């Protein structure tokens, strides 16, 4: 952990990093994960303190030592790839960067199902509707949503039922059920959406969602699918496929839906 690493003294932080890398090498095959890598490794022009630069260099040397002689895979977590030092993303050190991104409607549905696996939830939950409604919530946001729904159910049941009767037992707790109203309240009142940047998902708008423009639909289907569905045909001819199209016309004709539908047809973000 970045805070765990640079929470201690500079020499102590470097010693902790070296000890962690040595333990990972000893336990090969091992995975080194560094969440909040931007905390340890900021931009080189931005890292004000000399201690921070020294820690960055120590991490670089330790991972290079892993590269030359080890069997450890290093993973890192950061808000943005550019927030970390560009020297970190140097070839040999961080060759491949995986964009975790944001979950889509299906992804939010999967996350909610995962978090409700051990949660006794009623039949009115309709998690498909919740996920379709859920926007701006990513992962732990949906986890907090499920936790809020469960806590509201508990505060509705325990705080109003078992007060002076007799001490709580397993029968009352296992009888707890989470309803749709709890999920609605979690969505509305008690959930801060931490997502405000661009959305990267396959849009749910299909061709049936658009009326008319059949010729435009066919032309766009060509220009998009054909380069990606039949690359061999394009390679056979001496023409490079076009990588862009412009939609022009009166506002309100569905250019946005045209883009969404062509993305959905190709199952492309």
């Amino acid at each position: 952990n970045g805070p765990e690493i640079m929470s201690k003294l500079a020499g102590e932080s470097e010693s902790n990093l070296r000890k962690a890398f040595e333990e990972a090498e000893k336990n090969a095959p091992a995975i080194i994960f560094i969440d909040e890598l931007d905390a340890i490794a900021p931009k080189r022009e931005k890292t004000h303190g000399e201690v921070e630069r020294r820690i960055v260099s120590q991490l670089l040397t330790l991972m290079d030592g892993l590269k030359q002689r080890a069997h450890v895979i290093v993973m890192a977590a950061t808000n943005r790839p550019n927030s970390i030092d560009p020297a970190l993303r140097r070839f040999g050190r961080f060759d491949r960067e995986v964009d975790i991104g944001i979950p889509d409607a299906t992804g939010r549905l999967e996350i909610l199902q995962i978090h409700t696996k051990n949660m006794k939830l009623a039949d009115d939950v309709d998690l498909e509707q919740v996920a379709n409604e859920t926007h701006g919530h990513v992962g732990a946001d949906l986890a907090a949503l499920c936790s809020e729904a469960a806590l509201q159910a508990i505060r509705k049941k325990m705080d109003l039922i078992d007060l002076e009767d007799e001490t709580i037992d397993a029968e009352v707790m296992n009888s707890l059920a989470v309803t749709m109203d709890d999920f609605r309240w979690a969505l509305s009142q008690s959930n801060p959406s931490a997502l405000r940047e661009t959305v990267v998902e396959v849009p749910q708008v299909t061709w049936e969602d658009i009326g008319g423009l059949e010729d435009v639909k066919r032309e766009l289907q060509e220009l998009v699918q054909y380069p990606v569905e039949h690359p061999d045909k394009f390679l056979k001819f001496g023409m490079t496929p076009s990588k862009g199209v412009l939609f022009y016309g009166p506002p309100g004709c569905g250019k946005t839906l045209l883009a969404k539908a062509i993305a959905n047809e190709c199952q492309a973000n």
């Binding site: 560009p86 020297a87 140097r90 070839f91 040999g92």
Partner: protein
Amino acid sequence: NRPNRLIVDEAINEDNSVVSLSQPKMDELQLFRGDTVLLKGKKRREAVCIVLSDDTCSDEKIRMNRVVRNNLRVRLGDVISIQPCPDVKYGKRIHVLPIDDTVEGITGNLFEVYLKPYFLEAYRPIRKGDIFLVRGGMRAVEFKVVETDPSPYCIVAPDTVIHCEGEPIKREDEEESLNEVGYDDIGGCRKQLAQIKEMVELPLRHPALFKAIGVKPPRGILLYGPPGTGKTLIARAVANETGAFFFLI
């Protein structure tokens, strides 16, 4: 034009301790039968041992046990500089210990089971770095250098003492062989590679020559470009091929 500059070719005697002859060449050399002939090649590692178990093949290509290619050489087309240096001292004895394929199975003493039947009346005229095959069985195991009581190589004798306490290891030696990046590993910077060559050939390949003259050498090189363009690879290849000592700061 150097007389002892001759190719080396295929070999048939599975024992490395044998080094070939070429009677027309022996007349050129003083090659005597006995312990050793100093056959010199690349990287200073040689295959020095008993001699004259050859002349079965044609001339102009010395027969040298193929196992002295990986050592002392790389591939075919190379050249040997064979010059006798017999009558070496007789120190205690030369190390006995295997390296890779002996822990696989009965180990015992690692000397008196498989290797003992070979240091017989040919008591190891050798040079530390000569690697070969010797066994009392499947006939494929190495014999490497581990210890050195006498710095120069010698001819062993019985009554000596040996300690196989050592353990067979991994291919640290094989990895050592696999190193020293070269110009064959550089691509996309042919003009830059030639510029670097013409900059560093005189200061490195000819140190005393440049010390004779009073010109200023290029002692600072700024390889700048995008990350991952082989800058450290280019530097390592240049230093290794030219023989200059490379320090990776």
